[PDB]
Design a protein around this nucleic acid. Sequence first.
DNA 1: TTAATTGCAAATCATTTGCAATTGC
DNA 2: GCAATTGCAAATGATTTGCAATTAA
Lengths: 136, 133
Amino acid sequence: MVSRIEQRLIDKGLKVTDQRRVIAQVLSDSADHPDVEEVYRRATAKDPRISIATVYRTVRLFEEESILERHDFGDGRARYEEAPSEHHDHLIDVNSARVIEFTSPEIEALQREIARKHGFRLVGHRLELYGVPLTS
Amino acid sequence: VSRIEQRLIDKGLKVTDQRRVIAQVLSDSADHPDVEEVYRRATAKDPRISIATVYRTVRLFEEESILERHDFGDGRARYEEAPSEHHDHLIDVNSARVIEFTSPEIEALQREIARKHGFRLVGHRLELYGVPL
DNA sequence: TTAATTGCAAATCATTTGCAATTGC
DNA sequence: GCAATTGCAAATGATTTGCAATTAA
Ligand SMILES: [Mn+2]
Ligand SMILES: [Mn+2]
Ligand SMILES: [Mn+2]
Ligand SMILES: [Mn+2]
């Protein structure tokens, strides 16, 4: 009953409300990259005594505590995921909701070279691929 | 006529006074202005231009792939004339200024990752964030 | 000639905020 | 007890849209 993310709060000394418990639960069990509205929908599908604004506040708090990473894929709304322990980029299926995580060391290395050739130290990056399923 | 204006005449689009100016601006820019910034540039060359016209015009231009749009991480759409050759962006985190690069090796590798997963690449987005040495 | 565009304001959209009430530790 | 948190509801800030008058073509 004490979920992955719920524990992270306890260790950081954050007060654990009913609402924060279920948001933590929902986000703990989520495999994909939901937006704030999607979190609301799953949060209430577990307990209705939760307001739209506290999803927003909680999602923000979690982000501030490095419990969540935020992505602005372009589609207007902010989407969230539990902060991974290893870096990855994103492959968005333009034909469904499938989001595919991937790594490419060759790319990461090429990114570093480009910064260096340009007299920059690379301090971060955003990579997103957009795909359709192959048609031979 | 500007390059952009040439494109509207050829596309069949009505050229208005305001469109003539908004198109003059974005043909001349070599940076990545936001809508307010494009409005001020336009309001200057001819003050008889609404903000909504700017918003409408920039929407139109993008849909006609006359312009390209970007969200460089400042919660605000930025725009440029569609370049001849595709390029990605490196952003100076100290000044928010922007450098444009290309890299066939990355483009080739991107396609290969997509294929590796049962996909064909149809668009991508690559930004680099850096501090100057 | 006549349908597209403009200017204005009000309306969306996602997100935040003031405040009175509510609740965990 | 009390300080922290919640829930409306009513501000946002950026972008759009409805309508009447205007204008390119
Ligand atoms: Mn990467
Ligand atoms: Mn991910
Ligand atoms: Mn590229
Ligand atoms: Mn550019």
